[PDB]
């Protein structure tokens, strides 16, 4: 819910910069001369930055030394038809690259096999100026690399087509991460109104980074392979470590945990990594079921939780939820719901982006106003 606090930045600024440096008079001939010998070479660009350069497809060689010599020599009628298919190969790639650039306005999100093959991508990763740990990580997760990289069509001139493949740089690796799931926490009185609801808004991913915590509010922009969380530092805030205290105690004086207040008595289900949170309010049907034995639990009104062990389905009203069957150990920290600490008549019925201290200050203000009489 904290996506508006993030700063905005240009994602393809580096690739576009390399392109603008690639338009200089004599830079395409530089790259072509460098790749005249082999299919890959390090080239110092006119801006000073040294980039790796790949020749992934050679059509001038094939066209000018294998197809046109046999075609327009004498008796232009050709004797073998395997040349037609051999030319349909090695040319589909150019057509598909052209079409991908046409439909994606010249810069394509995840980098396809047509843009860059797995052998070429691994060869590019292995020859990068990074530590061996990042090389191993990138080589094992080539799919996440493709998802997190761009390909900007750069220039086409001097018989050469150029595009910049802008790959991620996984500088921070192997630090502990944790996901935070939240759900509305309301009172369970039978009255139609006067039912106050409180929720935590700091949901999303958190990772240790240089003594601080990189927090990602839009958890949708974070991929998970096995237990590794690939995130983008640009879609993130940077917070002190004390924010983690919000889990051991939400009233601690060090960090102020952002919350949200409302009066909407809505039953919901939030599926976590290993289990499910169920906020069952009103006359709604809340059910936990196993695939082979049917319904095994009926939820009482309030905020409850079940583990993914033995539970395969969570039903809330008409919504059906399949729980993640990932293995692990779950823990239930018993405690009294915080919502039982406030007065329903003095509680701020609506505040989108607030915190514990802010709500407490408004409560202090209203109580000081009331006490004067």
């Amino acid at each position: 819910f904290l996506g508006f606090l993030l700063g905005v930045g240009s994602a393809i600024a580096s690739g576009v910069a390399v392109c603008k440096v690639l338009h200089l008079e004599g830079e395409v001939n530089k790259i072509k001369s460098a790749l005249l010998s082999t299919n890959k070479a390090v080239v110092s660009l006119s801006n000073g930055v040294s980039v790796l350069t790949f020749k992934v497809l050679d059509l001038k060689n094939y066209i000018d030394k294998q197809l046109l010599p046999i075609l327009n020599k004498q008796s232009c009628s050709i004797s073998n038809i395997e040349t037609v298919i051999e030319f349909q190969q090695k040319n589909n790639r150019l057509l598909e690259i052209t079409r991908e650039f046409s439909v994606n306005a010249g810069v394509t999100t995840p980098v396809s096999t047509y843009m860059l093959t797995n052998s070429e991508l691994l060869s590019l990763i292995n020859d990068m100026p990074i530590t061996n740990d990042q090389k191993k990580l990138m080589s094992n997760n080539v799919q996440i690399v493709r998802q997190q990289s761009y390909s900007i069509m750069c220039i086409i001139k001097e018989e050469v087509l150029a595009y910049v493949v802008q790959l991620p740089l996984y500088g921070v690796i192997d630090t502990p991460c944790w996901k935070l799931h939240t759900s509305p926490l309301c009172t369970t009185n039978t009255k139609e109104g006067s039912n106050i609801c409180l929720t935590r808004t700091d949901r999303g991913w958190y990772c240790d980074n240089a003594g601080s915590v990189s927090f990602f509010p839009q958890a949708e922009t974070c991929k998970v392979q096995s237990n590794r969380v690939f995130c983008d530092t640009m879609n993130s805030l940077t917070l002190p470590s004390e924010v983690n205290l919000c889990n051991v105690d939400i009233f601690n004086p060090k960090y102020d945990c952002k919350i949200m207040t409302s009066k909407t008595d809505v039953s919901s289900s939030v599926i976590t990594s290993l289990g499910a949170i169920v906020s069952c309010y009103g006359k709604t049907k809340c059910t936990a079921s196993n695939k082979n034995r049917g319904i095994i639990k009926t939820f009482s009104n309030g905020c409850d939780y079940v583990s993914n062990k033995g539970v395969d389905t969570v039903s809330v009203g008409n919504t059906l939820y399949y729980v993640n069957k990932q293995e692990g150990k779950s823990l239930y920290v018993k405690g009294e719901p915080i919502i039982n600490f406030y007065d329903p008549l003095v509680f701020p019925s609506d505040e989108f982006d607030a915190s514990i201290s802010q709500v407490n200050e408004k409560i202090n203000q209203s109580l000081a106003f009331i006490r004067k009489s």
Partner: protein
Amino acid sequence: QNITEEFYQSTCSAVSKGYLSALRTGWYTSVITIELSNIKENKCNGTDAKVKLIKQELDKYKNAVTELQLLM
């Protein structure tokens, strides 16, 4: 060990620990090239079927090159 998860009924929220980080701290650009040919676009007899097919393929290739040129 492995992935663990704690559910706090106090604040109605769950935390899932045990994951590892791989953060995009930066970028690495790399120029990738495809060498093209300026084939002389004519002069053969369109009497054969194989030659007509090769000529159509050449039309496809040059139209691709032209489309790429129009991306500026």
